[PDB]
Amino acid sequence: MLLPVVARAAVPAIESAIAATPGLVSRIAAAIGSKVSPSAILAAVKSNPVVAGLTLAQIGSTGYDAYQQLLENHPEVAEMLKDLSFKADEIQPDFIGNLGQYREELELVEDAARFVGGMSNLIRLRQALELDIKYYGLKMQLNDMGYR
Amino acid sequence: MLLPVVARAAVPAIESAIAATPGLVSRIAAAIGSKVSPSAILAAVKSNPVVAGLTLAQIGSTGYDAYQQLLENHPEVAEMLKDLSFKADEIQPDFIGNLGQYREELELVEDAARFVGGMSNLIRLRQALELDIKYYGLKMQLNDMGYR
Amino acid sequence: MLLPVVARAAVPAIESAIAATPGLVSRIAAAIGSKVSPSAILAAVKSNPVVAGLTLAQIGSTGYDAYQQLLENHPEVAEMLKDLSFKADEIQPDFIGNLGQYREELELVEDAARFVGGMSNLIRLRQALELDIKYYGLKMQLNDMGYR
Amino acid sequence: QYREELELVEDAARFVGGMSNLIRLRQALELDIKYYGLKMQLNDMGYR
Amino acid sequence: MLLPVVARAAVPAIESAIAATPGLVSRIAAAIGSKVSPSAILAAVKSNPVVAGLTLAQIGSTGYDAYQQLLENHPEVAEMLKDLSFKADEIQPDFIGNLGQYREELELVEDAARFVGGMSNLIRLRQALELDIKYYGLKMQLNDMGYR
Amino acid sequence: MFNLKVKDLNGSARGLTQAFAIGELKNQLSVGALQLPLQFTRTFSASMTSELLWEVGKGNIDPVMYARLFFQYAQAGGALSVDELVNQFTEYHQSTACNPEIWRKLTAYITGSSNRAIKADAVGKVPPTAILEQLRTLAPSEHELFHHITTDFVCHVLSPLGFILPDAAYVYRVGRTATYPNFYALVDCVRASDLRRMLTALSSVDSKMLQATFKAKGALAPALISQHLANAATTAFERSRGNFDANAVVSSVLTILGRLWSPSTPKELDPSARLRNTNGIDQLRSNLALFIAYQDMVKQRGRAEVIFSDEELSSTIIPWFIEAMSEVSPFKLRPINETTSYIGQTSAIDHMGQPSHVVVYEDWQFAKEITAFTPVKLANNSNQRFLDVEPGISDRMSATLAPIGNTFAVSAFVKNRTAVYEAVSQRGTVNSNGAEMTLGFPSVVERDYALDRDPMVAIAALRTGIVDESLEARASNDLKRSMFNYYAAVMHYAVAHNPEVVVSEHQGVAAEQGSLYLVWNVRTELRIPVGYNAIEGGSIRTPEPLEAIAYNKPIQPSEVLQAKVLDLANHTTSIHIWPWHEASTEFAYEDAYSVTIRNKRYTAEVKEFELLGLGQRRERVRILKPTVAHAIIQMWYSWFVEDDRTLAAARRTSRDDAEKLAIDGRRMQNAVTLLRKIEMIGTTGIGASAVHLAQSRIVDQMAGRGLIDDSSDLHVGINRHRIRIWAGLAVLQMMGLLSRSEAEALTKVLGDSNALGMVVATTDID
Amino acid sequence: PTVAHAIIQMWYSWFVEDDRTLAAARRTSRDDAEKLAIDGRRMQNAVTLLRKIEMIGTTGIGASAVHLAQSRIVDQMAGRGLIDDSSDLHVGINRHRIRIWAGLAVLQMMGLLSRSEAEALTKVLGDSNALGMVVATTDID
Amino acid sequence: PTSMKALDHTSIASVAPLERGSVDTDDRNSAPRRGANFS
């Protein structure tokens, strides 16, 4: 059973999305596997929190607050919901050959990073060398006047 | 009696539902067992949380937030209210005979699962074997660069 | 090699099915993977009990008795033939969401059955309470006359 | 021409188990997703 | 992954920013480097909290409360967002270099000075990296001829 | 309880008949036409061996039990055979012993230095899990049991040097060994000796010289370690090489025993007087486990062929097999009177002397210890978990089960069967059918409980001979092994109690060349045959091993049969990989006691944690299953119900007066001893606590209704004897020892006799 | 305690420099029995650091912090209403975690070692995977 | 506070059984069984 804290945020959002468009109803009926009626898929949402998370993932505009609150209050559903919710992030044809050309560069970046410190130390040192020479003159003037 | 946090959301809900339509008043008078006057049913709601949950089940549009808030604040009412508010669903005639065709095949799925590991491990293995080959090449290429 | 005890009843049934129709000969030739000629598939039946069982699965109108005889003689052909003969049945789209609506109610059946005893004890108690009052009166009058 | 194919089949059978286990695993990974959802739901209701 | 507590306040803020103006596309393409589509940058925000902090720091209309909330929730991104959130303040024409604006830049110069050593050592290394490539070849050819 | 007709023994019990053992699906098997006498005096039986737990993560190599783990991984793991398993292990060991790079790379890893020597003080520690995880990468295989046997070899040779941590441990279970050897088991006992010769050369590597030069010099190069390991690996590989086929040794030594056992061998193929005078053939000729293994060989194979040179090779292959057997093995040679002494027999006798019913039973010892553990994971999606025993629950249930073992003997069950069959007997001879035989083997139902198997399929296997193909391999492979054991144990009992055995040769249908079978020459002094044979001449010739039991006298068992409990208490720190879930059960229970006090019903619920001394419902704990206790109690229950049904069937058709009073007095005496038994159970640890809790739940419910205290002379005694019977049923309900259907039927049997009334009628005084 | 703080600071600096030189020398070997020698040496140092920190964490104040942090989580979890605690907290990862935490927190409650130094010295064992390849613990109680 | 997040993400050296089975049975609890009725 789904928690009432999740249900208060989950049920009216699904009802509002169905009242906004009924074209999502057959989509979520085919995705979850229930009868096409809103009463039946709402019974499925109230019965099973995995089905609730699947519906709140299928409707994507208004269900993000309810989805993240379900993810807060039911922490154990996350692994199985991530297993069921998987879509192939489509790869580019030139991506692996374009990636293989950067070994020349990343090794130099990591070696300079080990010499300096962290990657944060490298970024701050690169910003210090990118910064103007007037600041070096100004800090020399403050050190001559006494400001450390 | 009834908690005031519940009452502040339940009483204007039921009163607004009666003001919206009066045909539900005789319906909740027959379902709960009170006199058909709104003062009598509202005093019954303020007196008894079981009667309050029955009224908030008989009105469903404007009373879902108040019903779930009563279910939050009154944990002791839940089983008794679910036992009183119960309607048996109708069964399809062909359901058990259609289910009997699948015994030969859920056993196949379980014998696959006992080999693979978890049911989640089976789902992830089936996704990895359905996955494209460029991801295998990308795994081998990142390991070829010296990244793990 | 197929044993003669099976072969005596297995060969003429397949031969009579071929003499009934040759349209199944191309089916069994494409199913096993032998030549389309009847002598070649009959030699395959005589030389391999697995091929014989696949033919007695393709035709089962007259070859049911020969199939049972090869079943009772060799167990290993059945252990392999259950794996080689598998058709995944069609599943309804509404099946799992339809089955979700019965969770509320099979639980109620089991919570009654644990109290009454067995499933048969529940069914007999249901029939005894649904039975007519005159049977209770007949029971009381036979006890009144001194019978048990 | 089939030495390339039979070697891969027998190497897969060495990992899986028997050839019967290989046939059953190939059928399971060829099987539709609705059966996996059905088994998950019967396990969710409390049925092993 | 991204925290749901801060995600509920971070996603609709940048969603309302994108729905208000489409001029942030060049900003999220140049600052992050993600793909130009609005779904890819939103997936990048949902995957990477550093990218989320960059998208909260690139605007200051409504995302300031979400940026402070992410700063209070995840302290490990604080120094990295402080490092990537650096704009070289050009010049104030007067003499008084007040620490309302220049404190970060003089602190960054003094952090680089604590790394290197002397302030003159930092200026010397700044100049040596500013110099031409040919002086390295000249020093190398003098050290090759037998002089040091 | 398995009931069979000794006359229609084909359709009755085909799974134990010798016609089925040598391939007769029909009933056609000859009486002793052409005959040749023989006297068996030895047998290869296994010891009193049950399953146990053994750990592998330490630096020891125990060669006999690595051989046993090969047995269980090859057979009980669904693999091919231990012959193929030892063949692939020899290939693996050859590849790692004839390769010098591996013994350098994984000494560079576990010493830390490739080229330079190590000092005696700068010696660190690497755990064996790490060296296993890199041995998996360097020397790959598909069987973990090779990587374990390499790992603890190198840990054995480095453990005095101090390069390894002694911390981790790791445990598997070993399985149940059969008592009587199959043909395949003889093949495997020949391969296991060669594997033991392999492994005992690895077990003797000392590194004493390496340790001595380490101490004397102060340093050593890694090349000395890499030589000193790769020399010992090849000294075991030299033992590995140059062996015989176990199949072609056993098939050749069983075929010549067939050709000098049979009476109708051709003169052409016939062992000459050299190999017949081989030293040891006179001992392998008078051996019985080899006879039943020969029957199984020619059953499976169909025929037999010789490969070896039949004059001088085979006269020196035989003592190799004699050494393989006479080595410490599972199977040891014993006299024939020793192996089957737990069987007992009794019969029900006519006035002429003829049996009507004959009962054959196993004499058991009630095991009365019990353990409760809890499973604790290590990491998610990893079944490496280990499990903690809990005293204070196992101690309670042990102290409850220890009095129940003092009232459930096995001799006192057949001793009650005989009193039933002597009390319901008429005066009239038995001619229409042979003496029906019941055989009470608790081990059948005990394995049905242990493997979670339906008892219908085991009874069907013993009845129609064949096993089922629907059920899985880990239950079918134990069903067939168990069924071979029952056939073999029956023939050992029959030959040890009728030593006058004469070997024939079946050639009626003759689907083989020669397949042998014994006949018996038991003298009877009877006149009408039980079974179907001819009784002519003062003695009967019967082919079947069960009729020869049906003509014996009562026999008394000299040895109990013992099953021991598994060991979770000693090694409680190791992690457990064996399936603990099939051999443990979930333990939760609810019961309620109802009594009417002056037209008002009072009910008292009770839970299991309230009985166990707990306050909080714990839900993780699991009991290791008591299959021996449950099997003995199930045999007792089925016999009690069957005896009551036969007396209720005979009381209706008695048609007499004194015999009718005898049947009624027998039923009353029966039910009151049942009631006293359950009531004596209900005074134990869990039972007395259930009494003291249910009384309190009843008394605080009579609080509102003021009622007058009763006589407190008989009323206390009656309500005490009713609450103790309830508690005595409830404790055997809550432990797995009794189903609710059978507790309810047993309550109906006790209720319809007015047994509590007849017990309270002897606590009055007139 | 300036002398003891000096000794432990010199130890920490030399110990981090040893891992830096080993991890730098493995990448430039191009030789299998040298890559295995360096990968063996790193594991062989990481397990000794784990043994030293746990021998500290099972002394007086370390054992007291172990008992206190276990007891407060037991009382909190029994108040929460679920008592899987004495099972799930005496196990191969969640006992090494609490012993190593206590052995570092005694050094932080003294002057002897800083919190960022303790966190980097933690990240060493977190990266060497020597926390899950040991499992056993020799306690002093 | 002293963070343990780097120490948290480890792995245990997995090693296979001789016999499979009993895999997904980690977290399941059926209802308690009743006793028979008494009379």
List, as one string, the DSSP characters of F345-408. Answer: EEEEE-SSS-EEEEEEEE-B-------EEEEE-SSTT----EEEE-TTTHHHHHHHHHHHTTS-
d(CA F4, CA F463): 9
Smallest CA-to-CA distance from F471 within B118, H19, C75, D36 is with C75
Provide, as residue numbers in chain A, all residues whose Cβ is less than 8 Å from the Cβ of B71: 4
Out of H3, H4, H10, name the one closest to residue G132 (CB).
H10
Burial class (CB in 10 A: 0-12, 13-18, 19+), F614: middle
DSSP designation for B31: I
Contact at CB, G37 and F573, closer than 8 angstroms: no
Provide, as residue numbers in chain D, all residues whose Cβ is less than 8 Å from the Cβ of F142: 14-15
Identify how the structure was determined: cryo-EM
3-class state of residue F542 by DSSP: strand
Two tokens at G87?
A: 């099972």
Out of A124, A125, A140, name the one closest to residue E119 (CB).
A140
C-alpha pair distances (Å), F56 with each of F156, F176, G19, H12: 12, 19, 34, 18
Resolution limit, Å: 3.5
Provide, as residue numbers in chain F, all residues whose Cβ is less than 8 Å from the Cβ of B113: none
Contact at CB, H20 and B113, closer than 8 angstroms: no
The dihedral built from the CA positions of residue F183, F186, F190 and F196, taken in this order, carries a sign that is positive
Q: What residue of B is the nearest CA neighbor of D31?
A: B109
Residues 6 or more apart in contact with residue F306 via CB below 8 angstroms: F252, F255, F256, F314
d(CA F357, CA F346): 9
Two tokens at A50?
A: 């995995």
Dihedral angle computed from the Cα positions of residues G24, G26, G28 and G34, in that order, rounded to the nearest 10 degrees: 150
DSSP designation for C85: S
> Distance from first CA to last CA of chain C, Å, rounded?
67
Out of E8, E111, E129, name the one closest to residue A65 (CB).
E8
Provide, as residue numbers in chain F, all residues whose Cβ is less than 8 Å from the Cβ of D15: 142
Provide, as residue numbers in chain C, all residues whose Cβ is less than 8 Å from the Cβ of F744: 117
d(CA E91, CA F77): 79
Q: What residue of C is the nearest CA neighbor of F471?
A: C79
Contact at CB, G104 and H2, closer than 8 angstroms: yes
Out of C83, C99, C106, name the one closest to residue D20 (CB).
C83
Provide, as residue numbers in chain F, all residues whose Cβ is less than 8 Å from the Cβ of G92: 378
> Distance from first CA to last CA of chain H, Å, rounded?
65
d(CA F579, CA G100): 33
Task: Count the Cβ atoms, other than its own, within 10 Å of residue F26.
Answer: 9
**Residue D43 contacts C, CB cutoff 8 Å:** no
DSSP designation for B29: I
**Residue B95 contacts C, CB cutoff 8 Å:** yes
H with G: touching (≥3 Cβ pairs within 8 Å)? yes
Burial class (CB in 10 A: 0-12, 13-18, 19+), F656: exposed
Provide, as residue numbers in chain B, all residues whose Cβ is less than 8 Å from the Cβ of H11: none
Residue F303: beta bridge partners? none
Question: Do A64 and E11 touch, CB atoms closer than 8 A?
Answer: yes
d(CA F640, CA F141): 57
d(CA F42, CA C85): 50
Residue found by looking up tokens 């249930």 in the block: F397
Question: Do B17 and B27 touch, CB atoms closer than 8 A?
Answer: no
Question: Do F726 and F684 touch, CB atoms closer than 8 A?
Answer: no
Contact at CB, D15 and F142, closer than 8 angstroms: yes
The strand pair at F355-362 and F372-376 is best described as: unpaired
Letter string b/e over residues D10-34, b meaning 16 or more CB atoms within 10 A of that residue's CB: eeeeeebbeebbbbbbebbeebeeb
d(CA F287, CA F742): 46
Element (H, E) at F502: strand F501-506
Question: Do C79 and F469 touch, CB atoms closer than 8 A?
Answer: yes
CA A1 to chain centre: 27
Provide, as residue numbers in chain F, all residues whose Cβ is less than 8 Å from the Cβ of C78: 469
Q: What residue of F is the nearest CA neighbor of B117?
A: F381
Residue F372: beta bridge partners? F623
C124 phi/psi in degrees, rounded to 5: -75, -35
CA F261 to chain centre: 32
Contact at CB, C75 and F466, closer than 8 angstroms: yes
**Residue B144 contacts D, CB cutoff 8 Å:** no
d(CA E32, CA E40): 11
SS percent in chain A: helix, strand, coil, step 5: 75, 0, 25
3-class state of residue F173 by DSSP: strand
CA atoms within 13 A of residue F330's CA, in its CB half-sphere: 24
Q: What residue of B is the nearest CA neighbor of F471?
A: B107
Describe the crossing of helices B64-73 and B4-20 by its angle, rounded to 10 degrees: 160
Provide, as residue numbers in chain A, all residues whose Cβ is less than 8 Å from the Cβ of D34: 33
Two tokens at F268?
A: 């052409």
Q: What residue of H is the nearest CA neighbor of B110?
A: H24
Q: Which residues of F touch C (CB under 8 A)?
A: 466-467, 469, 740-741, 744
Residues in chain A: 148
**Residue H14 contacts F, CB cutoff 8 Å:** yes
Q: What residue of G is the nearest CA neighbor of H10?
A: G129
Q: How far is D13 from chain C (nearest CA, A)?
A: 15
Q: How far is A37 from chain E (nearest CA, A)?
A: 30
Q: Which amino acid is at F649?
A: A
Burial class (CB in 10 A: 0-12, 13-18, 19+), F212: exposed
d(CA C116, CA C106): 15
Q: What residue of H is the nearest CA neighbor of C116?
A: H37
Out of A88, A95, A103, name the one closest to residue B145 (CB).
A103
Question: Do F486 and F462 touch, CB atoms closer than 8 A?
Answer: yes
**Region of residue F468 (phi > 0: left; psi between -120 and 50: alpha; otherwise: beta):** beta
Q: Which amino acid is at F98?
A: C
d(CA B103, CA B95): 14
C 59-88 residues with CB < 8 A to D = 79-80, 83-84, 86, 88
Burial class (CB in 10 A: 0-12, 13-18, 19+), F151: buried
d(CA F314, CA F406): 56
Residues 6 or more apart in contact with residue F417 via CB below 8 angstroms: F346, F359, F438, F639, F643
Residues in chain B: 148
Question: Do B59 and B24 touch, CB atoms closer than 8 A?
Answer: yes
The strand pair at F331-335 and F42-46 is best described as: antiparallel
Residue F517: beta bridge partners? F504
Two tokens at B12?
A: 């204007």
CA atoms within 13 A of residue F63's CA, in its CB half-sphere: 16
Q: Which amino acid is at F268?
A: E
Question: Do F577 and F700 touch, CB atoms closer than 8 A?
Answer: no
Two tokens at G19?
A: 């891992």
DSSP class per residue in F552-620: S--B---S-B-------SS--SSEE-S--STTEEE--EEEEEEEESSS-EEEEEEEHHHHTT-SS---S
Q: What radius of gyration do chain C's Cα atoms show?
A: 28
Contact at CB, D20 and C86, closer than 8 angstroms: no
d(CA C121, CA C119): 5
Residue F3: beta bridge partners? F438
d(CA F331, CA F488): 14
Q: How far is F622 from chain B (nearest CA, A)?
A: 22
Chains that touch F (3 or more CB pairs under 8 A): B, C, D, G, H
Two tokens at F352?
A: 């002429």
Letter string b/e over residues F463-502, b meaning 16 or more CB atoms within 10 A of that residue's CB: bebebeeeeeebbbebbebbbbebbbbbbbbbbbbbeebb
E123 phi/psi in degrees, rounded to 5: -65, -35
Element (H, E) at F516: strand F515-520
**Region of residue H21 (phi > 0: left; psi between -120 and 50: alpha; otherwise: beta):** left
Provide, as residue numbers in chain H, all residues whose Cβ is less than 8 Å from the Cβ of B114: 20-21, 23-24
Question: Do C95 and C36 touch, CB atoms closer than 8 A?
Answer: no
Question: Do A71 and A78 touch, CB atoms closer than 8 A?
Answer: yes
Angle at E72 between CA E69 and CA E73, to 5 degrees: 85
d(CA A64, CA A58): 10
Q: Which residues of F touch G (CB under 8 A)?
A: 104-106, 108-114, 124-127, 129-130, 133-134, 165, 167-169, 374, 376-379, 388, 573, 575, 616, 618, 620
Smallest CA-to-CA distance from G103 within G7, G8, G13 is with G8
